[PDB]
Chains A and B, each alone.
With several copies, the nearest count.
Chain A
């Protein structure tokens, strides 16, 4: 299922990418936690159709209905309703790289003051 592909992208730390239709991709890009993105151009160009069994008498009327809805702007209104109106998503080194050296340093300066004030205590308590 598409949901399983989305989960795999989200959970795989960048080590899985999912190939899916642009419509689904764009929808998920506007859902929390807003951690996925569509990249690149589309690989092909096609469409979704309303399907009927071969030769069904319903096909002609359905086709004209699709054209009427398209031309009235209703398909566009529905896409905006369900995709966008409801959307939920709206070099030098840094100290992060060398944080450790600084800690170690301030930890050996506090270890030196401990190894120096301890000796001082001894030598002083001994002289009493």
Chain B
């Protein structure tokens, strides 16, 4: 159907844009040292979630590993922006939602698989918001910082995930209305 084609495309799109977001290293555009004896560094660097690579300087494309642990209670944040479980939990959920949609087009009659997808997309978009907030709220703790296309993919992925969630619920409603009609 038309409502299904969009769901497949939307599930794929959301999952693709979030996987690229979690992997690419252009989340933030800030000023920082792209290398592990005073060093005249402070060169323009682009950072993702785990790697920071400077945009310019004698180290044109040298990368590094972010050090996320540089006293209590707050720590819990430093450890949620260091595993990045919320961005990664959002990838897993979107993948699981796709399985549901795909499984739906095979078994059929089940109806509750189509719903499950709806719960795995809406929650995926909800994990994403928490990951976005945690990201921003951690950098602030530590300027002309600007955001890159990996941030705006994770923002665009959220939008596509919520819309597929609406669409998947709208298909679940329609499946059940067809049952009530025959009754």
Within 79-123 of B, Cβ neighbours of A (below 8 Å) are at: 119, 122-123
Count class of interface residues, chain A: 10 to 19
Q: Contacts A96-B140, A96-B141 hold; do A106 and B126 have CB atoms under 8 A apart?
A: yes
Total A-B contacts with CB atoms under 8 angstroms apart: 25
List the A side residues contacting B129 at CB < 8 Å: 102, 106
In the complex, what residue of chain A is closest to B38 when comparing beta carbons? A90
Q: Contacts A95-B133, A95-B136, A96-B137 hold; do A110 and B38 have CB atoms under 8 A apart?
A: no
List the A side residues contacting B137 at CB < 8 Å: 95-96, 99
List the A side residues contacting B119 at CB < 8 Å: 113, 117
> What are 25 A-B pairs with beta-carbon distances under 8 A?
A90-B38, A94-B140, A95-B133, A95-B136, A95-B137, A95-B140, A96-B137, A96-B140, A96-B141, A99-B133, A99-B137, A102-B129, A102-B133, A103-B130, A103-B133, A106-B126, A106-B129, A106-B130, A109-B126, A110-B123, A110-B126, A113-B119, A113-B122, A113-B123, A117-B119
Nearest first, the 7 A-B pairs at minimum CB distance are A96-B140, A90-B38, A95-B136, A99-B137, A102-B133, A96-B137, A95-B137
In the complex, what residue of chain A is closest to B39 when comparing beta carbons? A90
Q: Which residues of B contact A (CB under 8 A)?
A: 38, 119, 122-123, 126, 129-130, 133, 136-137, 140-141
CB distance from B93 to the nearest CB of A (A): 12
List the A side residues contacting B136 at CB < 8 Å: 95
In the complex, what residue of chain A is closest to B126 when comparing beta carbons? A106
List the B side residues contacting A95 at CB < 8 Å: 133, 136-137, 140
List the A side residues contacting B141 at CB < 8 Å: 96
In the complex, what residue of chain A is closest to B42 when comparing beta carbons? A90
